[PDB]
């Protein structure tokens, strides 16, 4: 990383034209996600992390 275009790459966009929508697939959903939640816990008040 040379860090000059690294910041520049943050500000980028596509044409975004002709958006569609259809049904979903579970494997696609896993692709969208990066991890799975497994506890109902949200936040700790002991350390606020």
């Amino acid at each position: 990383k040379d860090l000059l275009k690294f910041l520049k790459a943050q500000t980028k966009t596509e044409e975004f034209d002709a958006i569609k929508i259809a049904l979903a697939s579970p494997d696609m959903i896993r692709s969208w996600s990066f991890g799975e939640v497994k506890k109902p816990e949200t936040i700790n008040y002991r350390t606020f992390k």
């Binding site: 500000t11 966009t13 596509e14 044409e15 975004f16 034209d17 002709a18 958006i19 569609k20 929508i21 259809a22 049904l23 979903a24 697939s25 696609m28 959903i29 969208w32």
Partner: protein, 48 residues
């Protein structure tokens, strides 16, 4: 004058420099909407 975070500072700097050029970006509210749709079992994406 909207949620485009990258556009607000750009426009402010342009006005300070007297550029008067408008850079669109793409509103973050649309991103929120897209994430909400994806939160459902719904496939949606933006093509080219």
């Amino acid at each position: 004058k909207s949620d485009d975070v990258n556009g607000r500072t750009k426009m402010y700097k342009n006005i300070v420099d007297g550029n008067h050029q408008m850079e669109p970006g793409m509103p973050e509210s649309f991103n929120v909407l897209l994430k909400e749709i994806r939160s459902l079992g719904i496939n949606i994406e933006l093509e080219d």
